[PDB]
Amino acid sequence: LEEPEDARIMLSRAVECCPTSVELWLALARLETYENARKVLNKARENIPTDRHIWITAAKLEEANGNTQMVEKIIDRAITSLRANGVEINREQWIQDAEECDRAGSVATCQAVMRAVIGIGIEEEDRKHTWMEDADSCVAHNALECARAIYAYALQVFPSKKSVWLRAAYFEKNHGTRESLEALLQRAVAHCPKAEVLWLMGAKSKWLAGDVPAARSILALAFQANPNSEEIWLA
């Protein structure tokens, strides 16, 4: 009703008598005062404690009014709540939080939450292939943060299949990132040079970009050492 300040004051006066009100706590989190926003989050903690959704609200607040260090600290606190409070991490909640932190806030906390949900909560047997598919689907709904989370979940562990790295490089090309394609090629070549997806894919991306001299330089780089068969020579 026509007044955000009066609304905040009324919500503070009501929440003093309404502890279990997630919507009221979230409204108070938007009080348009960073220090007072942190104070309101601390009061909500002193209110009905952060069990399931107030953790997500605090993560979003850290995404907006804060940096990545405090965001990661809050993510670790939520992971502690993921076992002490007795509430496992849900894939839909992680995807919704990533989308909200990409649309409104910074993508750093979205990526941190995606990493915390792909490492803890969603990990079944040595593969994280389902995690890779979920992160690709989130990349179809969010920014490149989901693709970066997929890369963190896959490339950091021993890459059993370089095709995930090739798909990430193709997505980076769809994002117009050639230096990121080179970095992914370097990571995959030093982790799994057992196919034509590390150096050959980068050489093809350079030869399909539009810079003929840069394509020739990339071909020279990939054919001098030649970490493949004579296919690099044909290219």
Binding site: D6, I9, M10, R13, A14, E16, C17
Partner: protein, 52 residues
């Protein structure tokens, strides 16, 4: 007639922030407060002698 009856009752069913102060005072106030006879005349459609 109903309109005559429904006129003498105010239909308020002043400010905003001091109203929230009023609400705070009301919260303080409520916190302090917390601290065989019925069958006479009935007719029977039967002869009295008919009852053994």
């Amino acid at each position: 007639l109903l309109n005559q009856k429904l006129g003498k009752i105010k239909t308020l069913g002043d400010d905003t922030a001091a109203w929230i102060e009023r609400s705070r005072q009301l919260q303080k106030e409520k916190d302090l407060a917390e601290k065989a006879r019925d069958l006479q005349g009935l007719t029977v459609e039967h002869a009295i002698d008919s009852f053994r």
